[PDB]
Design a protein around this ligand. Sequence first.
Ligand SMILES: Nc1cc(Cn2c(C(=O)O)c(-c3ccc[nH]c3=O)c3cc(Cl)ccc32)ccn1
Length: 563
Amino acid sequence: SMSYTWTGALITPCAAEESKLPINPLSNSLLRHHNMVYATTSRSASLRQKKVTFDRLQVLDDHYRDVLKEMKAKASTVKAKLLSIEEACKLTPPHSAKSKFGYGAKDVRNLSSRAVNHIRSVWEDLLEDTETPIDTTIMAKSEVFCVQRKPARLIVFPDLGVRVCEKMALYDVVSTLPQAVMGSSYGFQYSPKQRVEFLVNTWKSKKCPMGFSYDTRCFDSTVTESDIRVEESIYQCCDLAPEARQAIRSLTERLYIGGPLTNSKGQNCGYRRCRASGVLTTSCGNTLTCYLKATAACRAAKLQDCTMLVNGDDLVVICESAGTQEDAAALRAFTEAMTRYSAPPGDPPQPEYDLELITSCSSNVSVAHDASGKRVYYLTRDPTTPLARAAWETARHTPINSWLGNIIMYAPTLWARMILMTHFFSILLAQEQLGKALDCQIYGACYSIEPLDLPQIIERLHGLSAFTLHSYSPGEINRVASCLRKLGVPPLRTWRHRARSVRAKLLSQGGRAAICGRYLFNWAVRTKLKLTPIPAASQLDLSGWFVAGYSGGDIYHSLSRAR
Ligand SMILES: Nc1cc(Cn2c(C(=O)O)c(-c3ccc[nH]c3=O)c3cc(Cl)ccc32)ccn1
């Protein structure tokens, strides 16, 4: 069936759209080649529509059926709870898109009578009606990139009342079921330090390792109605409250498998028969589907002693080599099996014999040295997109601050320490905003974090070595330096000068600011300050941080204020 059908009505914006990076003094202190930075808009939506619209031909086999039964046997151990309306309301982001039915996210969070009444009516409708397709809005996503242009990605999501109901029925399922089913292969259970430990240990556990990343082209579009019902067959193995069983059944048939698409003007846009990017089950569903297809494909390809690491549509496989020619042929056999399963590749996969050459979750393993000279593996990535987005976020107030998430997740990197920490701490200190909570995303969930709490967060996630790494690899240094020349970012010597300046100001303030000066900027001086465990670090409640993926799932994970 066709992933989409279109009526001809346009994918429309709801307000004015900015595509060019503004010429602003603060963003220009970070990145001078402003014309290289752009944001996608609804203007390129028709280009994306062409790419995502295609017929799917899916052929299942015994390997697929065998893996599915094994996955279902593991899912059968799960007991999932139905969330109360209050619990589901507290998981709604404060700036989540308002309902078309006269209430918004603030009303949901405050448990307003109108919001609660409407949520109750939507819930009852899911219990009573098993068939009426649920309306969804389609919008072009606004995302920032560096040139060499990508067309806008499309986001498809149901009304706020429906999203609250999805949490009630499925938040516990999507949070617990993936690790029960996939075990150590489930990527979202790991902090970046745990992910690098898993990759390194997996790589070293093979006699002669071979690894590869597998990129599916337009994954959400490749997801069939059969795949979405298969995913539901796994959810149904949970012990569930009867109302949750009915809501999952109704949501699968009315929303997850497909439905009508409406633009921002209220016009009928078309019909979807593939994964919606903006529902609670997107991450969990994509992860399970990718794992199922890939596990079965490994068996079809006769790949030996396979270990997979899956995060949504992102897949990395580490296995035992059978020799270069044999591995090349087995990888073609894997690709052929994935294609039959309706998961064809974007770029054909390449066998890799060096762990640092694999790019998975847009990241690669690299090595640096701690204060004692001991080798420390850590995850890095090309800094082009993080820097382009940090420049955008400096010039415009954006709902999500990717710079903050990048500092948290890539804290040990040369680029996050020398550039992002230096730039943002300098600006925030000049604005007396170091203590102001900002929103960022970790594994798709929204968190409200104060920049002053970064030292303890980083220590918990990455260890104290995140503040002591040095002797970065020549390859990593060259990649960063080349990216700075390309984007017109001042060189690392300028960043060291700026860091010494902000470090002195932070130390002079005492309190939490001085902890930031001591730990975050110890790299900038020869006269190192002693770094001991931060007391606040052991007291941090990081429950929920690295449990599951929630991209597109409208999840907020910071504490709710009592009423
Ligand atoms: N490209 C992907 C990435 C993922 C998993 N993943 C995410 C993620 O965005 O989910 C982040 C991440 C980076 C910055 C801010 N916040 C974050 O969560 C991240 C960082 C490392 Cl080191 C490893 C994996 C990571 C899943 C699917 N496709």
